[PDB]
């Protein structure tokens, strides 16, 4: 922060905050409340900040390789796409339509419900829809040996979101750091959960309205804190439904297209008997049905290959009870 | 300050002696030795240092795992420091000064006698049992009705012959830290063997002795760290130990620590608890309390309070003086407090009659 004229305080990369006389040239415009400023070795003199910015390490994008999934599957409904069309491309870049109606669009996207997978399919599918910079980091990616670099990395990640538009940041399963432990050895583990509360303080800096898109995905939300799922920051909870009966037939069709034809092999019998023993055990066991085709030894997958794949997992033990059906 | 004047004025010789040994930072552990001159050493800075030793210290005094001084310039070995250990955990472990002498016994003879000869007698006359050997037992055990618990351990404190002994309880070793109990029980005997004459005591093994295994999820398996490792560390041969330790708990539970001790430990006694003619012994030490009338008969009120040990009849002479000041009187005749004693047994038995049968059953 800028405490007074001619001098200001600056935290060192090692984490120790330094109080340094500012250079007499530029005292104001490039100062900023929070920024990375170069310092001299011995004197740690304040001279020049970043543009901003040089950003940080790791990387972004990588989702543009193509192809993934076409959105035309839901194209027949138009009842589902109408809510999606209003929740995707209009929240991306639109301006005069918001201030008119006055509704402030939230940045919150929370994805729970796996299994099944869902998720990253609709991620690379948005890449087909629109083009934007995708920040992809694991929840554990910023864990380091020192606690001074941590607050800077998540700051450099969120400060390029407001700097560049449009921007989408994806972090996978932050429920790990959501674990609350006060112990000193876990102090850094609790320091990264306050980093999670730090970037949480930084996500209201996007308000309002420019700019960010925050998509959140986790396998288990029970360990998450109440204030993380509270509205005003994440106002939209998108629950991925359990595969149940609906995701069955859709997920057998998508794998058999990647499987070899199957112009001979007739899917009629594999949607019945293997469907009985499904766990589920839904998405990628269908890939195991294809991974028993590499077991062959056969050019066009035999009927015995499929049936053998699903029958191993998972077993059922019947029937002395449910026979009422 | 006048005591702080000459105290602070001594810094002139300090700074002269502060230049030597100033480089001792930091404490460092060694690793192995390929040859005599050069040893590899590791310091808490995380940096390992191979170095030779100064001509002031002989090479034979450097053993693997020894923390020694250093000269941060030359990195050479300076002076060895005996303690390797331990962060905290000592202050609750260390017990000093006496209390509760032998005169506080409540009349139990054979009980307190055979547990006195397991500890006080061997150390008071080492040549006796060595020439009489045979061999002293490897440990003891205490449990039963509550009276008299934790006092018999306090008896050896004031009866201690030379040096104070260590007290340890189970709940202070809980984790957080795992492995201290191992590290602890190894070092206290290493500290012992130098001066000997230091007992090791553990209390309340029932809570930490949960046995054996359950389906899931554990559960008892994290509790197996406390019971199995402590017994295993007790199961050593060295020697083992010189003071033959001690044990005290509430219930005999559980089965696994109870079946492990006969292979090592010995002298399992069951309280006892007052005898019908022994309840007056706790009244004898209480006969010196305040002013006792000569008409009082301790044999009369003893039978009226069964299974009262020394704790429940300590309230007798308490309720004696209690209602004495309530009634503004001075002494308490037998009939005075015993009228309240027949109440203190029954009215306190309304909610619980204080059975121990239902604990293990």
């Amino acid at each position: 922060e800028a405490v007074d004229q001619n001098t200001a305080i600056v935290g060192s990369t090692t984490g120790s905050n330094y109080y340094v006389r500012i250079l007499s040239t530029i005292d104001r415009e490039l100062l900023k409340p929070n920024a990375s400023v170069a310092l001299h070795k011995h004197s740690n003199a304040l001279v020049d900040v970043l543009p901003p910015e040089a950003d940080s390490s790791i990387m972004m994008l990588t989702s543009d390789q193509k192809p993934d999934v076409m959105y035309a599957d839901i194209g027949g409904m138009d009842i589902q796409k109408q809510e999606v069309r209003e929740a995707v491309e209009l929240p991306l870049t639109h301006f005069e339509l918001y201030k008119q109606i006055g509704i402030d669009p939230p940045r919150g996207v929370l994805m729970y419900g796996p299994p099944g997978c869902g998720k990253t399919m609709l991620a690379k599918a948005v890449a087909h829809h629109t083009t934007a910079a995708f920040i992809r980091v694991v929840g554990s990616e910023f864990v380091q040996k020192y606690l001074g670099e941590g607050p800077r990395m998540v700051r450099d990640v969120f400060r390029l979101a407001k700097e560049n538009a449009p921007a989408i940041i994806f972090i996978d399963e932050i429920d790990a750091i959501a674990t609350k432990r006060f112990d000193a050895q876990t102090g850094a583990d609790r320091e990264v959960q306050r980093i999670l509360l730090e970037l949480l303080n930084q996500m209201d800096g996007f308000d309002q309205n420019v700019n960010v898109k925050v998509i959140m995905a986790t396998n288990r939300a029970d360990t998450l804190d109440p204030a993380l799922l509270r509205p005003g920051r994440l106002d939209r909870k998108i629950e991925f439904p359990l595969p149940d009966r609906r995701q069955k037939r859709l997920i057998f069709s998508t794998i058999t297209s990647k499987m070899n034809l199957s112009e001979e092999v007739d899917l009629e019998d594999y949607v019945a008997r293997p469907d009985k023993i499904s766990g589920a055990d839904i998405n990628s066991i269908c890939q195991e049905s294809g991974m028993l085709a590499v077991r062959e030894n056969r050019y066009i997958v035999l009927a015995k290959d499929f049936e053998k794949a699903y029958k191993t997992v998972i077993k059922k033990d019947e029937q002395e009870h449910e026979f009422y059906k | 300050a006048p005591p702080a004047l000459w105290d602070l004025a001594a810094d002139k010789q300090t700074l002269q002696s502060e230049q030597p040994l100033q480089v001792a930072r930091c404490t460092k552990i060694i690793n192995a030795d390929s040859e005599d001159p050069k040893y590899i050493i590791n310091v808490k800075q995380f940096a390992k240092f191979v170095v030779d030793l100064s001509d002031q210290v002989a090479p034979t005094d450097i053993e693997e795992g020894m923390r020694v001084g250093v000269d941060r310039n030359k990195y050479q070995i300076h002076i060895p420091l005996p303690p390797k250990i331990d962060p905290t955990v000592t202050m609750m472990q260390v017990e000093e000064k006496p209390d509760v002498t032998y005169s506080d016994v409540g009349g139990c003879k054979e009980q307190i006698e055979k547990l006195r000869e397991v500890v006080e007698t061997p150390l008071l006359h080492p040549e006796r049992f060595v020439n009489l050997g045979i061999e002293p037992p490897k440990g003891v055990l205490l449990f039963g009705p509550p009276g008299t618990g934790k006092t018999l351990c306090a008896r050896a404190v004031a009866n201690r012959t030379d040096a104070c002994f260590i007290r340890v309880i189970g709940s202070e070793l809980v984790q957080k830290y795992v492995g201290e109990g191992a590290r602890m029980v190894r070092e206290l005997f290493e500290m012992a063997r130098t001066k000997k004459a230091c007992l090791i005591f553990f209390d309340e093994i029932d809570a930490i002795g949960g046995a054996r295994f359950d389906d899931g999820a554990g559960g008892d398996n994290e509790v197996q760290r406390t019971m199995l490792e402590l017994i295993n560390q007790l199961d050593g041969f060295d020697p083992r130990g010189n003071i033959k330790v001690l044990m005290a708990t509430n219930r005999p539970d559980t089965l696994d620590p109870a079946l492990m001790r006969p292979g090592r430990l010995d002298r399992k006694i069951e309280f006892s608890l007052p005898d019908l003619e022994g309840r007056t012994h706790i009244f004898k030490i209480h006969a010196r309390s305040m002013s006792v009338e000569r008409d009082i008969r301790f044999e009369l009120l003893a039978r009226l309070c069964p299974n009262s040990t020394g704790a429940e009849i300590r309230s007798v002479c308490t309720e004696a003086g209690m209602f004495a000041i309530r009634a503004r009187r001075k002494i308490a005749t037998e009939k005075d407090f015993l009228e309240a004693v027949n109440k203190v047994i029954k009215s306190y038995a309304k909610f619980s009659a204080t059975p121990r049968y239902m604990t293990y059953n």
Partner: protein
């Protein structure tokens, strides 16, 4: 550099690249960053050497009545040493692990170490729970160091205890309190599997109960010789009590038959306590001489239970 910094220097200078594959422990001077010599051996402190044991004060002759089941023990340790020349002719593979288990006291730990005294075998003391520390990855890294010495050193021997507890995988995990060791044991079992040279330096294991046993323990390099120890018979119970007392004075006028038949389920360690309690009463008795009736007195003393008597039971 172990300081967590990393540097860049030309190849030493002095000792050339002939030794060795990328190492550690080498000496280097201050900030000049030149390594004069490549220094062994490995690390660290108690991890390198767990315990230094010369030889026990007792020998295998101290067990009475167990001569049938000591031969199986003595064989597996002794046969790979002197009889190795006969194995290459007949294609014989020596046993590695041995499971020694019985209700305590079974005199297992005394018998194990005592067999290393006459065979010159260097003994190393180790316990299962000793491999668990606050810091994760300690006892696990120890076997990496321990079995590396098993390749470096020749048996000798290694003995451990309480393998059954540390071998508890529960049912629903994770995890138990034995974590570091249950990974260490199955690693101790892993290097026996994947690495053939590990057949050097046979390892003895001991358990106090069979309730929890890892089925993975069955292998040639893993536990092979297994003999259940019941309560010794009347002949053996009378023996062991005399052979535990060979180090001390033994009282005359003893039939040895009466004290033998009166012992049912009584432990061998309790038989030592019989001569203790009979020797403790010798103090107050005033005479160090003991009688045959004093044995059965201390025999019935410790067991069954203590100290009460049967009344109200009709």
């Amino acid at each position: 550099t172990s300081t967590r910094q990393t540097y860049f220097l030309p190849v030493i200078g002095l000792v050339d690249a002939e030794k060795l594959k990328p190492g550690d422990l080498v000496g280097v001077n201050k900030d000049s960053y030149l390594i004069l010599e490549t220094l062994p051996t490995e690390y660290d402190s108690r991890v390198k050497a767990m315990e230094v044991d010369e030889r026990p004060t007792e020998q295998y002759s101290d067990i009475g009545g167990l001569d049938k089941q000591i031969q199986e023990l003595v064989e597996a340790i002794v046969l790979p040493m002197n009889h190795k020349e006969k194995f290459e002719n007949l294609g014989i593979q020596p046993p590695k692990g041995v499971l020694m288990y019985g209700p305590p006291g079974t005199g297992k730990t005394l018998l194990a170490r005592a067999c290393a005294a006459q065979t010159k075998a260097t003994f190393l003391k180790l316990a299962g729970p000793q491999l668990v520390q606050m810091f994760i990855g300690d006892g696990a890294k120890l076997v990496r160091d321990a079995f590396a010495l098993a390749k470096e050193k020749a048996p000798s021997i290694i003995f451990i205890d309480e393998l059954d507890a540390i071998g508890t995988k529960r049912f629903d995990s994770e995890k138990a309190g034995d974590r570091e060791v249950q990974r260490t044991m199955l690693e101790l079992l892993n290097q026996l599997d994947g690495f053939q040279p590990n057949t050097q330096v046979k390892v003895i294991a001991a358990t106090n109960r069979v309730d929890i046993l890892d089925p993975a323990l069955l292998r040639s390099g893993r536990l092979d010789r297994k003999i259940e120890f019941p309560m010794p018979n009347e002949e053996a119970r009378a023996r062991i009590m005399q052979i535990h007392s060979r180090k001390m004075n033994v009282s005359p006028d003893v039939n040895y038959e009466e004290l033998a038949r009166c012992t049912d389920d009584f432990n061998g360690a309790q038989c030592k306590a019989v001569c203790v309690e009979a020797g403790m009463i010798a103090l107050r008795r005033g005479a160090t001489e003991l009688t045959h009736e004093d044995y059965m007195e201390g025999i019935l003393e410790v067991q069954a239970k203590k100290k009460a008597n049967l009344q109200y039971y009709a």
